[PDB]
Design an enzyme around this catalytic site. Structure first.
Site, PDB file in Angstrom:
ATOM      1  N   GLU A  96      37.225  44.564  50.820  1.00 37.68           N
ATOM      2  CA  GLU A  96      37.153  43.246  50.191  1.00 37.68           C
ATOM      3  C   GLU A  96      37.219  42.103  51.200  1.00 37.68           C
ATOM      4  O   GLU A  96      36.462  41.134  51.100  1.00 37.68           O
ATOM      5  CB  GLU A  96      38.268  43.086  49.157  1.00 37.68           C
ATOM      6  CG  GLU A  96      38.065  43.890  47.885  1.00 37.68           C
ATOM      7  CD  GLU A  96      37.059  43.255  46.945  1.00 37.68           C
ATOM      8  OE1 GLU A  96      36.669  42.092  47.178  1.00 37.68           O
ATOM      9  OE2 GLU A  96      36.663  43.921  45.965  1.00 37.68           O
ATOM     10  N   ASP A 133      31.658  34.049  44.481  1.00 37.38           N
ATOM     11  CA  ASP A 133      31.393  35.455  44.782  1.00 37.38           C
ATOM     12  C   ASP A 133      29.906  35.808  44.701  1.00 37.38           C
ATOM     13  O   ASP A 133      29.040  34.933  44.792  1.00 37.38           O
ATOM     14  CB  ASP A 133      32.208  36.374  43.863  1.00 37.38           C
ATOM     15  CG  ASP A 133      31.687  36.398  42.434  1.00 37.38           C
ATOM     16  OD1 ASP A 133      30.877  35.518  42.078  1.00 37.38           O
ATOM     17  OD2 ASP A 133      32.096  37.296  41.667  1.00 37.38           O
ATOM     18  N   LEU A 162      39.286  37.278  41.225  1.00 41.30           N
ATOM     19  CA  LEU A 162      38.527  36.363  40.379  1.00 41.30           C
ATOM     20  C   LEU A 162      39.449  35.361  39.693  1.00 41.30           C
ATOM     21  O   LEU A 162      40.430  35.749  39.055  1.00 41.30           O
ATOM     22  CB  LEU A 162      37.751  37.149  39.324  1.00 41.30           C
ATOM     23  CG  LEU A 162      37.029  36.325  38.258  1.00 41.30           C
ATOM     24  CD1 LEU A 162      35.569  36.121  38.635  1.00 41.30           C
ATOM     25  CD2 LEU A 162      37.141  37.002  36.902  1.00 41.30           C
ATOM     26  N   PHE A 175      39.084  48.558  40.721  1.00 39.41           N
ATOM     27  CA  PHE A 175      39.439  47.251  41.255  1.00 39.41           C
ATOM     28  C   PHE A 175      38.201  46.362  41.288  1.00 39.41           C
ATOM     29  O   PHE A 175      38.247  45.194  40.897  1.00 39.41           O
ATOM     30  CB  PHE A 175      40.010  47.395  42.667  1.00 39.41           C
ATOM     31  CG  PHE A 175      40.472  46.099  43.272  1.00 39.41           C
ATOM     32  CD1 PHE A 175      41.808  45.740  43.231  1.00 39.41           C
ATOM     33  CD2 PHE A 175      39.568  45.237  43.876  1.00 39.41           C
ATOM     34  CE1 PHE A 175      42.238  44.546  43.782  1.00 39.41           C
ATOM     35  CE2 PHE A 175      39.993  44.042  44.429  1.00 39.41           C
ATOM     36  CZ  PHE A 175      41.328  43.698  44.383  1.00 39.41           C
ATOM     37  N   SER A 209      28.941  61.472  37.418  1.00 42.07           N
ATOM     38  CA  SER A 209      29.778  61.467  38.613  1.00 42.07           C
ATOM     39  C   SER A 209      31.235  61.826  38.314  1.00 42.07           C
ATOM     40  O   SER A 209      31.849  62.601  39.049  1.00 42.07           O
ATOM     41  CB  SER A 209      29.695  60.113  39.321  1.00 42.07           C
ATOM     42  OG  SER A 209      28.373  59.851  39.762  1.00 42.07           O
ATOM     43  N   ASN A 234      24.743  61.074  43.266  1.00 42.78           N
ATOM     44  CA  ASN A 234      24.622  60.321  42.022  1.00 42.78           C
ATOM     45  C   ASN A 234      25.131  58.885  42.149  1.00 42.78           C
ATOM     46  O   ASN A 234      24.516  57.953  41.628  1.00 42.78           O
ATOM     47  CB  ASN A 234      25.352  61.041  40.883  1.00 42.78           C
ATOM     48  CG  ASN A 234      24.423  61.896  40.037  1.00 42.78           C
ATOM     49  OD1 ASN A 234      23.982  61.479  38.965  1.00 42.78           O
ATOM     50  ND2 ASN A 234      24.120  63.097  40.517  1.00 42.78           N
TER      51      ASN A 234
END
Ligand SMILES: [Cu+2]
EC number: 3.2.1.17
Lengths: 162, 162, 162
Positions: A11, A20, A32, A104, A117, A132
């Site tokens: 991040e 963003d 956010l 997250f 997956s 995948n």
């Protein structure tokens, strides 16, 4: 290495309010603040979370305040999700971080949508899941923020981070 | 040893609002709150910085909150100053702390006024700078808060601190 | 081991407002917020201490904020108490933690009421003090939060904690 340093690397840290990859006001470690076009609204929201008049600027410590909370929320969302809990139960400490990482970034609902997956991860099919997960829109819109995460699902080590 | 512990030692910690060497309301690690004669104004300013009703009292952690910010401000002031940046560029990690120390104490403008010393530091003339810096009013008004700093410019070690 | 980890173990951590062993609103590491029956009053008090709208929920760090303050208050109360200072002076680093522990839990006045035990501790009579302290109401109402503390007065080691 752990989930915190893992996300810290994926991040990154930004100590002032910014837009963003969708134009949403964000701060610290990918936190956010609001979907509102108003910067004052972003400042208003940040002030309530931090607990002081910040005027859009915070410290490394206050970024960690929002960080611990966000990580805990991602873990909580996984434990109380029927589609994610079995997957989380089955995984090892390292691949469990990769799962939290996705939640997250995308939220629990968004991650629970990877039917194939999640099934392959539950069945230790590491390579099939990686292949995948590369096909996803998640990888297309954010190949860098995702590349390491998929490699971690594949290897089960922290090698993509250091 | 580092700039934080260096200033921690030179400045010291005070957890309640106090008057400085000029009668100005201060707290924590040498953090100036206001030049106003009003204690309520000092309390009002502290509350805005910390983010709660403190009534003139803070914790060791909240003192570090103001501390990190102040150190960053001192470093920022050096990097964007034409008279200080060349000097900072040329110096070693240890003598760079001594420079930040002076700016922390006096501000960027006040430190940029030492034409001779800044020139001598830029030219590795350690002893000439130390001699000149002892002659200053900075040393006269605050010989203790300065003695170590000058010795550090001279030696390039942390020996005056431990 | 130290007083912080000692109390961390005896008190435990609770990140949301709860009622204690008397119905009093508490949070973090045994921090009393109010004796008021009102939860809003407990929230109102927490907000003033922490410095933000918490709505009854705090972080592990904010719990440590109230924790350091409470520990300091307990130590301060001991140093300025005529009945406790002589006892504190005479004790070793480990048994001094046990004293602070009791004051943290009961307050300085409540602990100063153990005339016999305080006398026996001052005279290194470890076993007599332990026996007497087991007889107390303090031990009856909270045998678990007290058992370790008394054992520490007896042994002078951290063995009851790890
Ligand atoms: Cu903090």
């Amino acid at each position: 290495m752990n989930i915190f340093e893992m996300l810290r690397i994926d991040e990154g840290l930004r100590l002032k309010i910014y837009k963003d990859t969708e134009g949403y006001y964000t701060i610290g470690i990918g936190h956010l603040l609001t979907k509102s076009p108003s910067l004052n609204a972003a400042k208003s929201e940040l002030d309530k979370a931090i607990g002081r008049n910040t005027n859009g600027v915070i410290t490394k410590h206050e970024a960690e305040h929002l960080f611990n909370q966000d990580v805990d929320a991602a873990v909580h969302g996984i434990l109380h999700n029927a589609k994610l809990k079995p997957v989380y139960d089955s995984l090892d400490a390292v691949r469990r971080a990769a799962l939290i990482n996705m939640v997250f970034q995308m939220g629990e609902t968004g991650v629970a949508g990877f039917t194939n997956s999640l099934r392959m991860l539950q069945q230790k099919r590491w390579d099939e899941a990686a292949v995948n997960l590369a096909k996803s829109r998640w990888y297309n819109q954010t190949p860098n923020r995702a590349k390491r995460v998929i490699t971690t699902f594949r290897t089960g080590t922290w090698d993509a981070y250091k």
